[PDB]
Amino acid sequence: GSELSERIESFVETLKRGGGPRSSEEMARETLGLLRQIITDHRWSNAGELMELIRREGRRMTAAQPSETTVGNMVRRVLKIIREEYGRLHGRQESLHKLLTSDFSFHYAQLQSNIIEAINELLVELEGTMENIAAQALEHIHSNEVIMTIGFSRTVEAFLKEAARKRKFHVIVAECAPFCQGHEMAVNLSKAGIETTVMTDAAIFAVMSRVNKVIIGTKTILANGALRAVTGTHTLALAAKHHSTPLIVCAPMFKLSPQFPNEEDSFHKFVAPEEVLPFTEGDILEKVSVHCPVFDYVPPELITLFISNIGGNAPSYIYRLMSELYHPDDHVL
Amino acid sequence: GSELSERIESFVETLKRGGGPRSSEEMARETLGLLRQIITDHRWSNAGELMELIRREGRRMTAAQPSETTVGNMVRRVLKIIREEYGRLHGRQESLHKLLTSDFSFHYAQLQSNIIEAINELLVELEGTMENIAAQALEHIHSNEVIMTIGFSRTVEAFLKEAARKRKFHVIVAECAPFCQGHEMAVNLSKAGIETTVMTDAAIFAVMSRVNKVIIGTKTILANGALRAVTGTHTLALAAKHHSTPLIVCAPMFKLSPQFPNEEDSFHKFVAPEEVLPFTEGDILEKVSVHCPVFDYVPPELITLFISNIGGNAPSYIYRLMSELYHPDDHVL
């Protein structure tokens, strides 16, 4: 009751003010725990009331920070789990087969336990996602390869660290300006014995002719296979496509969002201009427009392969995965 | 004279039957020497008779073996030299300037010596073409590069041997089947300490993703910048273009031919089918048509740079280099 309300308010304020869970997996775990607490503590009779309550809470959390798609993905996953459990306990996707060959008000006592155990199984699968992704490193990295990365991705770091246990290769890291988090990735990889190079994004094209493949992380994966990545990733993808360099996206399954790139002006995250132009510039700041987008849109045609905890896939198959995780009626939320 | 006629007949029969000068430079030297002997021994009152007799001899030599463009190039170079000598001694290109602004057979008793000394200067410049081309190796090869070659080219071998004196790199050689002369190139490069790999042409597209640049020779350079190279070079150029891999053609200036790719069905050299399908196959040879083209046509858009004894040029500039060497009236010959 009161404790749940305080937790929800704290989560919303943390999302609004930034910070909090640095790891995306940690944020997904916290969202799943909050949803589990909402299901346990709040009073509901049938599946419809629970779905409406979850929809309202997910709407609030999404409006708190629209750029954090993991919270909305978790809300939609919980809604799909609830729908599946209700259909299994009560009854027995849109397609041509369904079109040709032709009510959540009922209450069941054991529905809540099934929902809770399904959520617990989802959390358990979430805990082992990084190791599952990293276990496929050897199938994609050969001897004396050159790998190009941008920013600081923990999944890519685990990928490269696992691959380095048995193979020798070179890794080039571009500092994702202004927040040059690529330096941390470079020093972490160098601490593991991998030979690493530090360079600015301005050189991404220049060295791209000597890169064998590109391995990057992402913030969100759209329904068409497009990426919401860190800024400068679109340029890296274009440079890789210019040289036909394969581009690999190491992204967990919980970063898939059933949204489409139709939305505008809310995609990129705009932060204070101080990161790009310091306040000490003076008078010229009065008549200069400074914009600092944090995220970038990458079209699906620039992506070669998606590596997730379930294996490797092409972007053209992403829709099917998105059909297996989310109900089409929960896209609007 | 009888000796000159017998030399011309021997040259023509050697061209018709194949073999003879293994290197292109040796064939150019022999053609220039034959033309000089023709000019000295034959009796001509004026420049017109000399030009017509040289045209007749060049027609005979070209008809002896059309695929050997070096002989015709030498004939046209000598004709242009004669034209320029006569114009300088007697008088003082098509362009808009000439169009807006707007006669041989005049004996001068001094043209022969000028022609002979110009031919001698051309031969002297020809002697040092290979070293001039190889002197530019260090400007195009960096440390730990990967180079891809096809067949056996003397100029590329000199290029790589000169570059290896100061730099360490990897060279991949594709055997130009059926005449697997790439084995000789690989062995020779390994004798110089360069690390080399032997592979078939079927693997070209398989390995171009790990190649930094492609350095190849050619048999002929066309007026539009196109190439007549060994069979299999077109697919190599297409694979390099697929990966935006720069393609460098190391070819001396005497391989430029003012002809255009309009000519068809005589471009490639067709040899006995024994090289592709052995005679021991038996009955199936009765109803099987097997063709063995020796040369391939490479469009100019697949070539990045031409390296010759005068430096580096783009294909789009080839026409100018072609206008500086040959008169437009001698293209038909």
**CB–CB contact B212 A210 (8 Å):** yes
Distance CA A229, CA A320 (A): 22
The Cα–Cα gap between B157 and B314 comes to 22
Residue at token pair 């496509």: A241
Report the gap between the CA of B247 and the closest CA in chain A (Å). Answer: 13
Residue B258 · residue B228 · CB < 8 Å: no
Contact A209 B242 (CB under 8 A): no
Q: Residue A178 and residue A187: Cα distance in Å, rounded?
A: 18
Q: Are the C-beta atoms of residues A248 and A165 closer than 8 Å to each other? A: no
Residue B83 dihedral angles phi and psi, to the nearest 5°:
-60, -45
Range of the domain at B227: 133-324
Tell me which DSSP letter residue A214 carries.
Answer: E
Peptide bond into B278 cis (omega under 30): no
| Closest CA of chain B from A171, distance in Å | 15
Half-sphere exposure (CA, 13 Å, Cβ side) for A188? 17
Tokens 């600092």 belong to which residue? Answer: A292
Strands B311-313, B305-308: pairing is: antiparallel
Angle between helices A69-90 and A24-41 in degrees, nearest 10? 40
Q: Do A212 and B212 touch (CB under 8 A)?
A: no
B211 to chain A: closest CA residue: A210
Angstrom distance (rounded) from CA B67 to CA B76: 16
Contact B158, B182 (CB under 8 A): no
Strand ranges across the sheet with B213-216: B195-200, B170-175, B146-150, B213-216, B247-250, B305-308, B311-313
Mutate to test the interface with B, among A170, A195, A205, A243 (most CBs of B within 10 A): A243
The burial of A279, by beta-carbon neighbours within 10 Å (0-12 exposed, 13-18 middle, 19 or more buried), is given as exposed
Q: Which residues contact A262 (CB under 8 A, 6 or more apart)?
A: none
User: Pseudo-torsion of CA B30, B32, B35, B41, nearest 10°?
Assistant: -80
Q: Which residues does chain A have within 8 Å of residue B246's beta carbon, measured at their own beta carbons?
A: 209
- Cβ neighbours, 10 Å, residue A205: 15
Residue with tokens 């009779």: A45
- CATH code at A183? 3.40.50.10470
Rounded to an integer, what distance in angstroms lies between the CA atom of residue B123 and that of residue A10? 88
Tell me the CB-side half-sphere exposure of residue A195, using CA atoms within 13 A. Answer: 7
Which of chain A's residues have a Cβ under 8 Å away from the Cβ of B210?
212
Angle formed by the axes of helices B182-191 and B154-163, to 10°? 20
Rounded-to-integer distance, Cα B241 and Cα B306, Å: 16
Residues of B in contact with A242 (CB under 8 A): 244
Cα A64–Cα A69–Cα A75 angle in degrees, nearest 5: 85
Size of interface A-B (CB pairs under 8 A): 18
| Residue B104 CA: distances (Å) to CA of A273, B58, B60 | 77, 20, 23
| Cβ neighbours of B243 in A, within 8 Å | 243-245
CB B329 within 8 A of CB B80: no
User: In this structure, how many other beta carbons lie within 10 angstroms of the beta carbon of residue B328?
Assistant: 11
Tell me how many degrees the CA angle A12-A24-A320 measures, rounded to the nearest 5.
Answer: 105
Between CA A234 and CA A211 the distance in angstroms is: 17
At B270, phi and psi to the nearest 5?
-100, 125
Q: How was this structure determined?
A: cryo-EM
Contact criterion met (CB below 8 Å) for A161 and A138: no
Resolution of this structure in Å: 2.3
Q: In terms of DSSP H, where are the helices of chain B?
A: 2-17, 24-41, 47-64, 69-90, 96-101, 111-127, 129-134, 154-163, 182-191, 204-207, 233-242, 318-325
Evaluate the CA torsion angle A54, A60, A63, A67 in order and state its sign: negative
Pairing between β-strand B213-216 and β-strand B146-150 as defined by DSSP bridges: parallel
